[PDB]
């Protein structure tokens, strides 16, 4: 139930292919709006555990998150 995930990830693009690492997405989320800590970085690691390699493959692992 989502669309334009390509542009959504390219907005906060760090590696050029939307595969921003866990720390990349962490500082993207913390800098804009709310900020958090070790709990947030553990939560981000859990979220990126679907890929299991750091390079968040959004185009594949967005469907489960948006389902």
């Amino acid at each position: 139930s989502e669309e334009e995930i390509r542009e959504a990830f390219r907005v906060f693009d760090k590696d050029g292919n939307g595969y921003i690492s866990a720390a990349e997405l962490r500082h993207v989320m913390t800098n804009l709006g709310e900020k958090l800590t070790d709990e947030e970085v553990d939560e981000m690691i859990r979220e990126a555990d679907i890929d299991g390699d750091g390079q968040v493959n959004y185009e594949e692992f967005v469907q489960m998150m948006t389902a």
Partner: protein, 340 residues
């Protein structure tokens, strides 16, 4: 070649003559006002002063009735120079002579000393007939504006056949300096009309129609805010109060037309506004994406915590953020296409 020198000297002489005619056309009006007020307030005690101030009006009119002829002679010479034919008999047209006669008979009306504080009718009309001498103002304004003072201007004027009509100069003045001219017109018409009405309705009982009432009645008629506490009571005063209402609507139309133009952006302001909109759109899109991701993850965590009320609230927030992001993306693409 002396043709350019001839044209320039003739134009300069015409400018001087037109300026001096307008200078001498105001002394008569001032003396008329002074004599009319002296005969009212002074009374029958002052007669020698009235005679002295009345003879000077005739002297001024006699001196004025020659500058017009000199100016028209200069016009005839200029016509000859521009259309060289060396025959003065053929250069003069019948309608030109008719308009010369009309000008001389209009400019020559004054209360001459042919022979208690009330101006008997037949003299109060001759006096008020001296305000027709204001037709010299447009000539002295147009010809001294410098548009006719350069041959380079005349070249393009003949190319486009503009003829330098007074409408062009009026439009140029309106576009260049609006506001000051409008206040000048609206404050120079509340004093030259508040005296004519006072003359029309001057009462000797308790000064029921002097300047203490006309200066209040005229401004509430020009603006169509007629109260009704003071009203004209004479036919000659009623006709004046209808001529200050027909030029109180034209001034409003002019003001509306002038104001409508001043609210439009120029070329640079549009670009500045476009940039200021683009930066805000980009930053709000970034913030909206951040909110979308944060709310999605928080909703997932709350579902993992099994409460479902914060989860449903976060679902509502997620839907709101998603549609806001879609809307802002659509708008950003729209004005980016507009700029491109």
């Amino acid at each position: 070649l002396g043709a350019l020198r001839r044209r320039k000297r003739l134009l300069e002489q015409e400018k001087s003559l037109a300026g001096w005619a307008l200078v001498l056309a105001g002394t008569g009006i001032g003396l008329m006002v002074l004599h009319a007020e002296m005969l009212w307030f002074g009374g029958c005690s002052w007669a020698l002063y009235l005679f002295l101030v009345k003879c000077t009006i005739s002297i001024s009119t006699f001196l004025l009735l020659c500058l017009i002829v000199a100016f028209h002679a200069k016009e005839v010479q200029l016509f000859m120079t521009d259309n060289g034919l060396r025959d003065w008999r053929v250069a003069l047209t019948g309608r030109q002579a008719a308009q010369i006669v009309l000008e001389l008979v209009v400019c020559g009306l004054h209360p001459a000393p042919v022979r208690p504080g009330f101006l008997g009718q037949g003299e109060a009309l001759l006096s008020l007939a001296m305000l027709l001498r204001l037709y010299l103002v447009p000539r002295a304004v147009l010809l001294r504006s410098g548009v006719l003072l350069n041959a380079s201007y005349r070249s393009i004027g003949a190319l486009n056949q503009v003829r330098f009509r007074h409408w062009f100069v009026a439009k140029l003045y309106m576009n260049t300096h609006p506001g000051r001219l409008l206040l000048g017109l609206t404050l120079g018409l509340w004093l030259t009309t508040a005296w004519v009405l006072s003359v029309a309705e001057r009462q000797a009982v308790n000064a029921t129609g002097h300047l203490s009432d006309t200066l209040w009645l005229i401004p509430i008629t020009f603006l169509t805010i007629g109260y009704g506490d003071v009203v004209p009571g004479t036919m000659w005063g009623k006709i004046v109060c209808l001529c200050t209402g027909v030029m109180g609507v034209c001034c409003t139309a002019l003001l509306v037309a002038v104001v409508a133009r001043k609210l439009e952006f120029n070329k640079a302001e549009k670009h500045v506004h476009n940039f200021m909109m683009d930066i805000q759109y980009t930053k709000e899109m970034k913030e909206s994406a951040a909110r979308v991701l944060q709310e999605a993850w928080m909703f997932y965590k709350h579902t993992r915590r099994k409460e479902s009320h914060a989860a449903r609230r976060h679902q509502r927030k997620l839907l709101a953020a998603i549609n806001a992001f879609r809307q802002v993306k659509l708008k950003h693409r729209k004005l980016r296409e507009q700029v491109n």
